[PDB]
Amino acid sequence: GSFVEMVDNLRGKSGQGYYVEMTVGSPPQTLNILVDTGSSNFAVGAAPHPFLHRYYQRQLSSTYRDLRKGVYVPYTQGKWEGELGTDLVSIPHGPNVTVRANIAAITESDKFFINGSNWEGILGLAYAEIARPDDSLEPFFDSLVKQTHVPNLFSLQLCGQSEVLASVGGSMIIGGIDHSLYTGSLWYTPIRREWYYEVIIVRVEINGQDLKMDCKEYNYDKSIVDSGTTNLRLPKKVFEAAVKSIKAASSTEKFPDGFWLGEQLVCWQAGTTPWNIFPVISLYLMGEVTNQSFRITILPQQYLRPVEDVATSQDDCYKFAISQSSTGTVMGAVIMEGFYVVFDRARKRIGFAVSACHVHDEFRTAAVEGPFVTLDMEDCGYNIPQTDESRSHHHHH
Ligand SMILES: CC1(C)Cc2ccccc2C(N[C@@H](Cc2ccccc2)C(=O)O)=N1
Ligand SMILES: [Zn+2]
Ligand SMILES: [Zn+2]
Numbered sequence: 515g516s517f518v519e520m521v522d523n524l525r526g527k528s529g530q531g532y533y534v535e536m537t538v539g540s541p542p543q544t545l546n547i548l549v550d551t552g553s554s555n556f557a558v559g560a561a562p563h564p565f566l567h568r569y570y571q572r573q574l575s576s577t578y579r580d581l582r583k584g585v586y587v588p589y590t591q592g593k594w595e596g597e598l599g600t601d602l603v604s605i606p607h608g609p610n611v612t613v614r615a616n617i618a619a620i621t622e623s624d625k626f627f628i629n630g631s632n633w634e635g636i637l638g639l640a641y642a643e644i645a646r647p648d649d650s651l652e653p654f655f656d657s658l659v660k661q662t663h664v665p666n667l668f669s670l671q672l673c674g675q676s677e678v679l680a681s682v683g684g685s686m687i688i689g690g691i692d693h694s695l696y697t698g699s700l701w702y703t704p705i706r707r708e709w710y711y712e713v714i715i716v717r718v719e720i721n722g723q724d725l726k727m728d729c730k731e732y733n734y735d736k737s738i739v740d741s742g743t744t745n746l747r748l749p750k751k752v753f754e755a756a757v758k759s760i761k762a763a764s765s766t767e768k769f770p771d772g773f774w775l776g777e778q779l780v781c782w783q784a785g786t787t788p789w790n791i792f793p794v795i796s797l798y799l800m801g802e803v804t805n806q807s808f809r810i811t812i813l814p815q816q817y818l819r820p821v822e823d824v825a826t827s828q829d830d831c832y833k834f835a836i837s838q839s840s841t842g843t844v845m846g847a848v849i850m851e852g853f854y855v856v857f858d859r860a861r862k863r864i865g866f867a868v869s870a871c872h873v874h875d876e877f878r879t880a881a882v883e884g885p886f887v888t889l890d891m892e893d894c895g896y897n898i899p900q901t902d903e904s905r906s907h908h909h910h911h
């Protein structure tokens with residue numbers, strides 16, 4: 515598993531994430547596993563489901579050990595639940611190691627496995643703090659690093675039919691950075707706290723124009739990098755200011771309200787989409803150096819996502835892939851697809867460079883540029899109100 519063996523090891527469907535092959539058990543059971551930087555459990559379908567045709571069969575694994583502990587994970591509209599255990603785990607197209615990891619065998623779920631996704635489980639790559647049922651279930655990547663010599667880093671290159679969804683590809687390089695996957699400078703922003711991959715946005719511009727908000731609004735109540743989310747999601751106030759600005763720029767076109775809520779497509783005749791009327795968006799991330807930031811600039815082709823339907827086929831049609839949040843900013847596939855993203859856990863930082871699989875615009879380029887210096891930079895981080903539950907739990911580690 516040299517970095518050439520890991521290049522191109524991701525597949526997916528537009529809008530249903532990216533997955534990597536993993537094996538579980540002995541003899542090895544091969545499954546397609548969602549790459550999820552927004553969660554911290556390794557959980558696999560482990561019983562029949564109408565939208566799965568394989569699943570982890572614990573009883574066929576001579577190396578499985580039951581942990582005799584359930585786990586139940588609610589989502590906004592779905593859930594998964596299941597039984598904890600440990601087993602041997604390998605990534606066939608990753609580092610040439612086998613590790614004993616925790617595995618949540620999903621016994622029941624609701625609105626979790628979707629018709630046609632092709633993944634059978636999820637690999638939560640974020641930190642122990644957000645693992646369920648608690649921060650004592652070691653996440654996979656922590657086990658990998660503790661048990662082998664793989665460096666404490668991984669990087670993701672997420673690269674951007676008349677009925678069915680577009681096929682996508684990408685690379686997850688485990689333990690390193692492959693310089694063939696990016697061009698230009700690699701810029702790093704600090705990991706603020708090690709729970710989500712949390713970062714701090716200091717400034718936001720839409721077509722070069724500053725939104726002029728209190729910068730804490732940008733990170734209210736956090737900002738995170740999440741391969742498990744499709745859209746760029748923005749806190750309410752920031753989302754309203756952004757929509758106002760993109761509307762202004764594109765006001766040659768009056769779209770319905772449902773378009774701006776992502777609930778309706780807008781279409782132009784084939785090949786005619788006026789890309790020039792939709793503005794670029796720049797997020798400026800706090801730099802490694804005090805008073806410095808750098809920006810990542812996304813093109814309209816990243817945040818307006820094509821969708822082919824049956825009646826709409828003389829036409830190119832698009833969904834607005836920026837949406838309102840009440841749980842802070844989420845830099846999802848919409849942001850990550852422009853970029854090679856380095857999750858440098860050893861150095862508590864995340865790097866961005868322009869990806870080699872570039873998203874194309876006629877006259878503009880998605881970009882990563884810096885530094886930009888601020889006289890008296892000042893703190894853009896939000897401090898989430900400390901609940902009595904968080905406050906009482908003891909962490910004897
Ligand atoms: C799967 C995951 C990580 C967690 C989840 C759980 C339940 C419903 C939707 C989602 C969800 N929604 C994503 C969309 C998506 C991404 C990757 C695969 C499938 C859908 C989102 O809400 O942006 N993401
Ligand atoms: Zn394979
Ligand atoms: Zn105690």
Ligand SMILES: [Zn+2]
Nearest residue numbers: 649908909910
């Ligand atoms: Zn703890």
